[PDB]
RNA sequence: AGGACCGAACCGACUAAUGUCGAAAAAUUAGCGGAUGACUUGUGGCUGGGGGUGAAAGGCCAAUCAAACCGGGAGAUAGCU
RNA sequence: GCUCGCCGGAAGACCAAGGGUUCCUGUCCAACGUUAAUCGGGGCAGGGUGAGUCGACCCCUAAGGCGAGGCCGAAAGGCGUAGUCGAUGGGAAACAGGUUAAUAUUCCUGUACUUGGUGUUACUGCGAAGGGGGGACGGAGAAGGCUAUGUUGGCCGGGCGACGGUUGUCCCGGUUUAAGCGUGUAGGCUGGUUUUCCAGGCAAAUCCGGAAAAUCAAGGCUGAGGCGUGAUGACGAGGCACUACGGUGCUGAAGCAACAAAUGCCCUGCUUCCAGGAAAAGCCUCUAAGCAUCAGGUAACAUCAAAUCGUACCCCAAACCGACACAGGUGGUCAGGUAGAGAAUACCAAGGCGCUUGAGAGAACUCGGGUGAAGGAACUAGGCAAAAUGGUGCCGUAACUUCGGGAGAAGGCACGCUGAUAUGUAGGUGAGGUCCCUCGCGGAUGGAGCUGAAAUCAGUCGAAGAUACCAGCUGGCUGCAACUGUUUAUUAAAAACACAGCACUGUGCAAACACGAAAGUGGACGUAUACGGUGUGACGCCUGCCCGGUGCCGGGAGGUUAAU
RNA sequence: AAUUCCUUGUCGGGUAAGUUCCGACCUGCACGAAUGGCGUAAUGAUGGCCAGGCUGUCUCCACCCGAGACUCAGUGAAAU
RNA sequence: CUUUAAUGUUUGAUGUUCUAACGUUGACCCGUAAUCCGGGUUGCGGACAGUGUCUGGUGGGUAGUUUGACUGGGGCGGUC
RNA sequence: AUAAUG
RNA sequence: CGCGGGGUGGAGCAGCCUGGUAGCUCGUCGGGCUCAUAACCCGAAGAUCGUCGGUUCAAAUCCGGCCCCCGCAACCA
């Protein structure tokens, strides 16, 4: 079967990445929730 | 000649190609070419607008000379050319100054023919001059809605507008739809009928024929579910509903012409 | 010349068997259909929750779609178990 | 270590995507491996990723994202100009050999090549977000010229062989060599050079474009491969040498010819067809704003610089994606022998493995299959499943039809080996020689050698010669849909959906319509032979009767009618 | 007849025997001319039906070869 | 007061011409190496069109919901 | 202007 | 078996929701017109209302049963 997740670091960085979140206020809300959450992982990264 | 294809294979039996031997077999004049990427019918929002289009063979836009800005300049057509976007053929006119620009091809045109533009020009077809020196009732095309606009009316193949009345600066016209309307006398117009009138004769002849035209197949509304389309439903092609557009606007008899401000230009309604 | 014929790759998923604590949350085996085209696919985008997309099944949109998922109203309500 | 067996268009060898040390060595093993394990993608420790030439980064650009002002929007924000991102594209340049336990076009050896900076010398007018040329393009088909590669012959080296023959028409092995440089071929395109004039190319122009003559008939561009050089070098079978018995040191002959032949190259071609087939920069060329004893531009030489990142391993999988060491899913490249039309398929080479539980028993029953007397669909919801049909050449082939079909209709015949025709033919390829010549990778003549079907005749073997794998069941009536296609991924591949065609209807462009509170786009850079919508669904013969109800359209007298 | 209730209508053909199929009789429960009507060559993993051929589909199964079942050793589930 | 004529004043109901509002996805020039936008001339329309306020009408495109019970089960019928 | 049949 | 409608001169149809006194066309009968028929013209006859019972002063009319006809319903495993 073809699994729904076919990996791709580039497409992941361009959407789920830090800069993709910084591009709009809605992503900054996400990062604010991340820092509020206290999680060590702010965003996916190399 | 409009040769009919032999039914050597299925789906070719109904094909009726319109051969045009006069057309040049070679590459288009390079500088006038420019990119024309497909839109897919999507808008800036990216949501679909014009349904059942897109796809088809790649094509490049031609910079046809609508305005005919040159005045009193002699010219000779170099070679006929086919514009994939257009139904009508285009001619690569060679101006005396050596500048080249494509224009719409009159039905009465051949290679090496001489033409010219300007307020003077000539009654000879293919010339483009403002509607004042034009004799009443002569065939015209590429009419401008406003002076300097370039080209608007009857630019399609096989289409032409004939003068019926000339009310001073106003110039009444018989549009191909039969809807009479006046235009400014200052507006330029090209004499003679538009060429490639045989384009209507083509009947495609195959299921995939829409696909390279950028046309896409249309789904009938009865086939659609009631949630998606106002029609449809039932357990056996049930109907009985009044016909409508998918958004619910009435069809098969629902006029929507009400700009109001432009109505004054209109004289007689289409019939 | 062909949405042409036969037939691999490739694609499509018709019959039966196998298998339904299976090797696999849809397969494999033995036969099929398409296969120069309305073809297939790689890569990167655009279109999204009363909307998208849809050669139209009311399908598809992260194994969930006659209205996705997440979180918040919310300890909703339930003459019911 | 000796044998068997499997894939061998892969079950092999290189990468990308994607994993993140799984790579190599030492050592250990509880836990990890469906078994034991002194084994391991497991534990621990150490080692391993070498670039001016590869890629990325970089210059540039498509879809598209962001977006200085701006427009719009209750706020958030949306749209979008200049710009700048975005390779899945384009853009300068490296090969051969050798070496490590694990890395190399990256190191070493040999041989080069390209883009810039600087200095000297000899000369010269140089110079933009500007112009032009170039970059720069489709499907399909055909044929020619070559190569990768294979076979044979020759040559070289070795063997002459443990059951019969085997110094011969004999057997085994080797016969490998690039980038660069020189020549510039097969072949492809375009008539060139000189001068004048000019509303053309947002300004200018010697460039391009156009109009004129002058004058000769070729010049120039593009272009695989070949031949020399690179290379009296490297590589090289086998001996000769040392063994911690893993390997190292040394030596090293021939290294040609003919034929077959690509999906690879010439070809980003030629021809043909329509569905008319990116953008920009690097590149070439022309000027302006400018600047001339300068700065710059060209040529030669010297010299310097080319940084940064990736480089291990897996990569159709136990390392990716699948909760598994999972019969699944995952793009590209290289690519041989025999048989065959074939990348099918069968058997093999190089190469990789025998799939992480075995040993006996040989029951019912289950699964994967072989064969089976007589009947041959009597089975059953139903010829489901199996059996069978199966290739090439040739004969022959109906009803019906839109005159292409049906059709590969159906139904038969000829298929092996050997010899002769013919001490292997037709054909293909092509040396020696001769001859022409404006001398070259030449044009003719000439035919050795090599390669090599097919057909006829004769003979012969087997029960069976398309002998295996491979490899259509066919015919007739009829329903339906024209047909190709498309659909419920994961129980519905269909009469449904779509379909060309036909009809009606909407629309004069600031188009109807569509998204969006709006701006703006889409339609469309199209516009009435255009497009949207609906219905119908090739084609052939056709398509009536009814406007009462309902929908639409036209008309406006009057009745009525809200805000005001 | 993908519409036909009554019904397995009736007549004719195919089969020894045919609620299906083909042709026809029209009493069309409840076809009808672009939610098209009637034909139609080619085409079909389409529906129904017939023949040849072919066969363990069956009459009636039999035997053999392999993977399990079984025994021994090792590891070691599940629903309930 | 009734009935009526001339002129002025005060406004309403119409039909034409005009420009200054306004519309301009006409052309040219500039910001500007930008077709956006803005500004300046000019052309064609022109107190139309358009938007806002208010209101009539149409309105399943959309939203919130209704669609009772009794019943020898349910529904039909009947009943309250 | 309307008149069928024998 | 349920709901709704209908039954009237020889035939096809009103009146049958507000019960006092059933009409229409055609056919039939008689007399004209034509040499005759059909037609035309004139005149006349013909049904106490499917049948059987109840209220009501009185019923084709309202009510109820029965005998018929017709449309529709006869549903979800």
Swiss-Prot record, chain A:
It holds the Pfam family Ribosomal_L34. One of its GO terms (biological process) is cytoplasmic translation. Keywords: Ribonucleoprotein, Ribosomal protein. Gene3D superfamilies: 1.10.287.3980. It comes from the Bacteria. GO terms for molecular function: structural constituent of ribosome. The keyword Ribosomal protein applies. GO terms for cellular component: cytoplasm; cytosolic large ribosomal subunit. NCBIfam families: rpmH_bact. Belongs to the bacterial ribosomal protein bL34 family. Part of the 50S ribosomal subunit. This is Large ribosomal subunit protein bL34. It comes from Escherichia coli (strain K12).
Curated annotation (Swiss-Prot), chain B:
Belongs to the universal ribosomal protein uL2 family. GO terms for cellular component: cytoplasm; cytosol; cytosolic large ribosomal subunit; DnaA-L2 complex. SUPFAM superfamilies: Nucleic acid-binding proteins, Translation proteins SH3-like domain. The keyword Repressor does not apply. The keyword RNA-binding applies. This protein can be partially replaced in vivo by its H.marismortui (HmaL2) or human (L8, from the 60S cytoplasmic ribosome) homolog. It holds the Pfam family Ribosomal_L2_C. GO terms for biological process: cytoplasmic translation; negative regulation of DNA-templated DNA replication initiation; ribosomal large subunit assembly. Part of the 50S ribosomal subunit. Forms a bridge to the 30S subunit in the 70S ribosome, contacting the 16S rRNA. Interacts weakly with S6 in one of the 3.5 A resolved structures. In pull-down experiments interacts with CedA. Keywords: Acetylation, Ribonucleoprotein, Ribosomal protein, RNA-binding, rRNA-binding. Gene3D superfamilies: 2.30.30.30, Nucleic acid-binding proteins (2.40.50.140), Ribosomal protein L2, domain 3 (4.10.950.10). Residues 38-47 have a biased composition (Low complexity). One of its GO terms (molecular function) is zinc ion binding. Residues 27-52, 220-271 are annotated as: Disordered. It comes from Escherichia coli (strain K12). InterPro entries: NA-bd_OB-fold, Rib_uL2_dom2, Ribosomal_uL2, Ribosomal_uL2_bac/org-type, Ribosomal_uL2_C, Ribosomal_uL2_CS, Ribosomal_uL2_dom3, Ribosomal_uL2_RNA-bd_dom. The modification N6-acetyllysine is found at residue 241. This is Large ribosomal subunit protein uL2.
């Amino acid at each position: 079967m073809k699994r729904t997740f076919q990996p791709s670091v580039l497409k992941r960085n361009r959407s789920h990445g830090f800069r993709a979140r910084m591009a709009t206020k809605n992503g900054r809300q996400v990062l604010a929730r991340r820092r509020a959450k206290g999680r060590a992982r702010l965003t996916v990264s190399k | 000649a409009v040769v009919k294809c032999k039914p050597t294979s299925p789906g070719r039996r109904h094909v009726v190609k319109v051969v045009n031997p006069e057309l040049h077999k070679g590459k288009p004049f390079a500088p006038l070419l420019e990119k024309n990427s497909k839109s897919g019918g999507r808008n800036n929002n990216g949501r679909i607008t014009t349904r059942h289009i897109g796809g088809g063979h790649k094509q490049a836009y031609r910079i046809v000379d609508f305005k005919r800005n040159k005045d009193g300049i002699p010219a000779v057509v170099e070679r006929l050319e086919y514009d994939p976007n257009r139904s009508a053929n285009i001619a690569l006119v060679l101006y005396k100054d050596g500048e080249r620009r494509y224009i719409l091809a009159p039905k009465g045109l051949k290679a090496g023919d001489q033409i010219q533009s300007g307020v003077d020009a000539a009654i000879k077809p293919g010339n483009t001059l403002p509607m004042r020196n034009i004799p009443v009732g002569s065939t015209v095309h590429n009419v401008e809605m406003k002076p300097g606009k370039g080209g608007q009316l009857a630019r399609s193949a096989g289409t032409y507008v004939q003068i019926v009345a000339r009310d001073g600066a106003y110039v009444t016209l018989r549009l191909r739809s039969g809807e009479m309307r006046k235009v400014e006398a200052d507006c330029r117009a090209t004499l003679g009928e538009v060429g490639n009138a045989e384009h209507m004769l083509r009947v495609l002849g195959k299921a995939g024929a829409a696909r390279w035209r950028g046309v896409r197949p249309t789904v009938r509304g009865t086939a659609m579910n009631p949630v998606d389309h106002p029609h449809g439903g039932g357990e056996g092609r049930n109907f009985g509903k009044h016909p409508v557009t998918p958004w619910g606007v009435q069809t098969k008899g629902k006029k929507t012409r009400s700009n109001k401000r432009t109505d004054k230009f209109i004289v007689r309604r289409r019939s």
